[PDB]
Amino acid sequence: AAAEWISQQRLSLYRRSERQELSELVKNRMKHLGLPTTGYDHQNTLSYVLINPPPDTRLEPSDIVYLIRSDPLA
Amino acid sequence: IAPVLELAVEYVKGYPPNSPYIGSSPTLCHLLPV
Amino acid sequence: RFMQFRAKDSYSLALSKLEKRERENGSNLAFMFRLPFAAGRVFSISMLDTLLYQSFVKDYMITITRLLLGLDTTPGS
């Protein structure tokens, strides 16, 4: 009855995506090198730089404001 | 000839573990047990 | 033609004339009657170029070849 199990994996490997292929390649190399697979567990964002925006622009969350901090020793 | 009908060490069989590259189609192969 | 070359061989030397006639009639398969190729002793990767050019007209051609070669494995094929 092993052929039934073989067919199960065969459909699974055929249905598997490229992300799973890339994910398994990293994990295969990690166990070969001895590193735990967990912790390897995508970038759905768009970022840009605003040079000197007007004083009326709204502050959104996760915003990073470039600062020129004065010399602490002076 | 019968007519065509209108109506119908030993090796393990598995997939090679370490795929060398991405896109290598997994073929069930004759594999060494170890 | 230089795969298994018998210089003192009238038959293989006569195949040269046949391939020149086929090359005369504009045949793209002129190497076809060389004995090593017809026997499967030689092939060229330039056939893969023709496979890619053919796919402009036959979008199934690359898939069919890999199915025959086993390069792609579809369940039930």
Curated annotation (Swiss-Prot), chain C:
| Tissue specificity | Highest expression in liver, brain and spinal cord. Lowest expression in skeletal muscle.
User: Where does the record place it?
Assistant: Cell membrane
The stretch of residues making up the signal peptide is none
- Impact of altering residue 39 to T? In DEE14; variant homolog in rat has increased channel activity upon positive potentials
Q: What does this protein do?
A: Sodium-activated K(+) channel. Acts as an important mediator of neuronal membrane excitability. Contributes to the delayed outward currents. Regulates neuronal bursting in sensory neurons. Contributes to synaptic development and plasticity.
Family, as annotated: Belongs to the potassium channel family. Calcium-activated (TC 1.A.1.3) subfamily. KCa4.1/KCNT1 sub-subfamily.
Query: Under which name does UniProt file this protein?
Result: Potassium channel subfamily T member 1
Q: Which residues of the intact protein are shown?
A: 909 to 985 of 1230
